[PDB]
Chains A and B, each alone.
With several copies, the nearest count.
Chain A
Amino acid sequence: TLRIYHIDGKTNHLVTSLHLVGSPIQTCTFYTSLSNQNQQNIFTAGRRRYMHSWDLSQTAKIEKFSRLYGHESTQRSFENFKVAHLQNSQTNSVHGIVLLQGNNGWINILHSTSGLWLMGCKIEGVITDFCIDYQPISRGKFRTILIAVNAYGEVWEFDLNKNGHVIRRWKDQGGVGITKIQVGGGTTTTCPALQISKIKQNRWLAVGSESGFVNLYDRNNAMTSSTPTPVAALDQLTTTISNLQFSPDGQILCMASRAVKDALRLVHLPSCSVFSNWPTSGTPLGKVTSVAFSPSGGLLAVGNEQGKVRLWKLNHY
């Protein structure tokens, strides 16, 4: 199912509740194009070979992407994917791309508004995760950089403005089994832009690893040190990391472990300090399994194993 809610403090009502038949929903993200600002697609996928795109009032427009124009042999499924912008840089045209994981190292990229196979990037080892960093170049131009991360600890930085070329590598210090990378501080997936000029380069980079560890790096010195040292090595969780998400302004880092109940930790930045007053022992979380921030209002939505989503508010914002 997909459930779109209108969100408030007193009434969090249903706006729409679609039910796909015979297709589980592992991930589902909104998307709005930066050129048009009126597209409002919703992408969703599970452990199948099809990716449903619902356009955005009583009949649903659900297209689905299922065909790979080059190769259906790189990936078994679509269950992990991300959405990004991309500028063509010959024509000043921006459009959405869809990043997908494959079998061994294959990252597949699909032009999203039409389902085209655009480009492909293969890391060595097994992919465990990836993320989408932005770099503004001039007034009216940027370039997107795909940051992919192996299991063992390497990190590859490709650019997607021109076709897939590795800009650089560097290995995470330590980090045997990495689960999730996530950049933050600027415009990214959890805090998207509304025009071209609002795109800002992300500041921090977190790497979360199944020994409960999180290494936190600063981009301004990793990019020049080329085998960097983490600004911090947080360790307050004892099971695998399943959600690393920054604030929409780059001040808080939430890390959530799916394995044990009440496994959420908030870390103030740049002071790299775990918040002490929250969450407590008597804080209702359950087995935390999805985290989300508001783009502006400082709301924090946390969904657990028992189907409940709960909703806090940071009163500073």
Chain B
Amino acid sequence: VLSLSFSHDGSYLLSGGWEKVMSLWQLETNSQQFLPRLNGIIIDCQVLGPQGNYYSLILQMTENNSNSDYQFLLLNASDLTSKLSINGPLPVFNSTIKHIQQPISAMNTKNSNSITSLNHSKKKQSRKLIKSRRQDFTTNVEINPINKNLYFPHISAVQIFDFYKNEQVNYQYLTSGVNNSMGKVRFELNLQDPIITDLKFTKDGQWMITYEIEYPPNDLLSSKDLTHILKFWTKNDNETNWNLKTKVINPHGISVPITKILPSPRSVNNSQGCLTADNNGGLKFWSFDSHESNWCLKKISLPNFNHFSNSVSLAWSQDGSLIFHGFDDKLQILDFDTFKKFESLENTKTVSEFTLDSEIQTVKLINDTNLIVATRTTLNAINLLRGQVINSFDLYPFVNGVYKNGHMDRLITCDERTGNIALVINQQLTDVPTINYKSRIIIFDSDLSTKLGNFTHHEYISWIGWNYDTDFIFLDIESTLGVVGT
């Protein structure tokens, strides 16, 4: 149990525990009334009014095990409806950040601790952040351009936020989970909801592309497979709740993740297609059918590589001509009309197979002439009309073991009108790397001609994108959203 709050009379006891329920006990006949579904467990309850008119209650939102996501709620006692709800943006970090501590329960789970487990986990997290170098915390964040709406892929959910007024406008579940259909108890807390790992839009803005992974329960016969689900949705500008139209189970077959997703631009099919890429190197191009309201596997290039490395990415030429494919130690160029390599009859050594030193993280074209690639040890800026290298910079002394693959892809972005903007993270240390972080956001242009501007920030920054007003948006570890702009 987490909250106990008496009424002003002393005849009613408001109780709140791990299951997402608020129990009003009438102490005379020892009866009760319930609030069973609240989108999160409740830490605190309190009565406010002089006659006891409002119930205030603070919720934990512990589904995000990395970020303890709070929510303030205020109810009329009359109808027991949500009179007022206040909540900030809820990112999904790769690890717990500073002091985030799982609340008290009976069993130490993936979402809770025991008491000896509380002290041990506090010591363990502190020693983890002091010892390790893998502090990434890179969260996926998407931006809907047709409304400039901030989209947060919460764990088995989406939080639609608008930073102009700094308010959460929507919260929507997408997976067939038990987030709201049922609370969770001491032994069910080891069960976890499906993880919606990837979420983007098309340039039309009317099609929402999703990819989640399902986790079967432990200690079973089929506790091994990670069922990969893709979905396409649609919402209007007069609505705010997306509607699913196409479901897809197991793209490219069973148990193979489809980690890299890239939408289509409006130039080829009015941005109604997508490209899905695995560790195997297969590229599947799906497209929305005309006569059928669903999408279809229009194109497919299917290699079958015996090795596996998820350090995969792809970029797309602005006219839809060719596809860059960043693979571990390899750069591929793919024709779009046949899903073959870029066969040039003139043979001017603008080949479709480039060797690189380490695993490629990002490959981004700023136009039809300049391509910047960020591999796990360095960055290289090259031309496309000519196969001549221009720029190169080291990523080794800072990006040493900080991230896994794909995190640089979700980090660095590129604007079509001003150039590229990247990120670096450091920490101030006093004799042990101290917890306090310090990042730098650097603005370049035209395949790193010069630094347009370097700007250090006194704390951590986990995500950077650009709003379509041509202004770049960065996050903090705290849910604070800032902008660099003209």
Contacts and interface: CB of A to CB of B under 8 A. Distances in A.
B51 A69 contact: no
Contacts of B87: none
Interface in A71-116: 71, 88, 93, 95, 111, 113-116
B244 interface: no
Interface stretch (B26-34, B163-171, B462-470): B26-34
Interface string B1-38: 00000010100100000000000101001011100000
A219 interface: no
Contacts of A70: 26, 29, 31
B79 interface: yes
Interface string A39-65: 000000000000001000000000111
Main secondary structure of the interface of A (DSSP, over half): loop
A67 interface: yes
Contacts of A71: 29, 31
A114 B33 contact: no
B31 A116 contact: no
Given A93-B51, A114-B51, A69 B79 contact: no
Contacts of A113: 49, 51, 53, 78
Contacts of A117: 26
Contact of A115 (B31, B32, B49, B79): B79
A69 B24 contact: yes
Interface residues of A, number: 18
Contact of B79 (A65, A88, A93): A65
Contacts of B29: 70-71
A115 B33 contact: no
B33 to A, nearest CB: 5
Interface of A: 53, 63-67, 69-71, 88, 93, 95, 111, 113-117
29 contacts: A63-B76, A63-B78, A63-B79, A65-B78, A65-B79, A67-B33, A67-B80, A69-B12, A69-B31, A69-B32, A69-B33, A70-B29, A70-B31, A71-B29, A88-B9, A111-B51, A111-B52, A113-B49, A113-B53, A113-B78, A114-B51, A114-B76, A114-B77, A115-B77, A115-B79, A116-B12, A116-B52, A116-B77, A117-B26
Nearest to A115: B78
Interface string B114-139: 00000000000000000000000000
Of listed B49, B50, B80, residue having the most chain A CB within 10 A: B50
Contacts of B53: 113-114
B79 A64 contact: yes
B interface, how many residues as a size bin? 10 to 19
Of listed B24, B49, B51, B53, residue having the most chain A CB within 10 A: B51
Contacts of A111: 51-52
B26 A69 contact: yes
Top 4 A-B pairs, shortest CB-CB distance: A114-B77, A63-B78, A115-B78, A69-B33
Contacts of B51: 93, 95, 111, 113-114
Interface string B64-83: 00000000000011111000
A74 to B, nearest CB: 12
A114 B49 contact: yes
Of listed B9, B24, B80, residue having the most chain A CB within 10 A: B9
Of listed A67, A114, A115, A117, residue having the most chain B CB within 10 A: A114
Contacts of B79: 63-66, 115
Given A67-B80, A93-B50, A115-B79, 10 more contacts: A63-B76, A69-B26, A70-B26, A71-B29, A111-B51, A113-B51, A114-B51, A114-B52, A114-B78, A116-B77
A41 to B, nearest CB: 11
Of listed A65, A111, A117, residue having the most chain B CB within 10 A: A117
Contacts of B33: 67, 69
Nearest to B25: A69
Contacts of B26: 69-70, 117
Contacts of A114: 49, 51-53, 76-78
Nearest to B47: A114
Nearest to B7: A116
Contacts of B31: 69-71
A39 to B, nearest CB: 10
Contacts of B80: 67
Nearest to B9: A88
Nearest to B34: A67
Contacts of B52: 111, 114, 116
Nearest to A62: B79
Nearest to B10: A90
A140 to B, nearest CB: 18
Contacts of B24: 69
Nearest to B54: A114
Interface string B259-297: 000000000000000000000000000000000000000
Contacts of B77: 114-116
B57 to A, nearest CB: 15
B83 to A, nearest CB: 10
Contacts of A88: 9
Nearest to A95: B51
A108 to B, nearest CB: 12
Nearest to A33: B51
Interface string B319-344: 00000000000000000000000000
Contacts of A93: 50-51
Nearest to B81: A63
A22 to B, nearest CB: 17
Contacts of A53: 78
Nearest to A94: B51
Nearest to B8: A91
A100 to B, nearest CB: 16
